[PDB]
Structure 1
Amino acid sequence: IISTHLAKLYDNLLEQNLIRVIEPFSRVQIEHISSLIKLSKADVERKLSQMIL
């Protein structure tokens, strides 16, 4: 229960943070957004792809 719910909370937090950090940008490069969120480039790329899809 804790694992699943905390994973869902982590997903929600990542979504909110990514949406917050892309509001000013219009063509932000992935490396800068990953650094802003303090996450691996691949993880942010995958999350952004899922969010768009």
Structure 2
Amino acid sequence: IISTHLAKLYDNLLEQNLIRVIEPFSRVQIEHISSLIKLSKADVERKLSQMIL
């Protein structure tokens, strides 16, 4: 019960935080957004990859 709850909390957090960095559109570099968002380089690439689909 705890795990499920924590998981739902994780998907929402991830989506909220992204919108702010991305917002100019165009070709923002994965690296500049990464710094602002408060994420690591390896983690951001993977999160974005899931998100396109």
Q: Which TM class, normalised by the smaller chain length?
A: 0.7 to 0.9
Q: Distance in 1 between matches of 2:8 and 2:34?
A: 20
Q: CA RMSD in A?
A: 1.4
Q: Distance in 1 between matches of 2:43 and 2:16?
A: 15
In the alignment, structure 1 segments of 5+ residues that lack a partner are none
Q: Distance in 1 between matches of 2:25 and 2:11?
A: 22
Number of corresponding residues: 53
In the alignment, structure 2 segments of 5+ residues that lack a partner are none
Larger RCO (alpha carbons 8 Å, 6+ apart):
1
Identity among equivalent positions (%) equals 100
Tell me the TM-score normalised to structure 2 length: 0.78
Deviation at 1:25, TM superposition (A): 3.4
Q: CA deviation digits over 1:1-53, x for unaligned, max 9?
A: 23331232122111121123211131111111110111111111111111101
Tell me the TM-score normalised to structure 1 length: 0.78
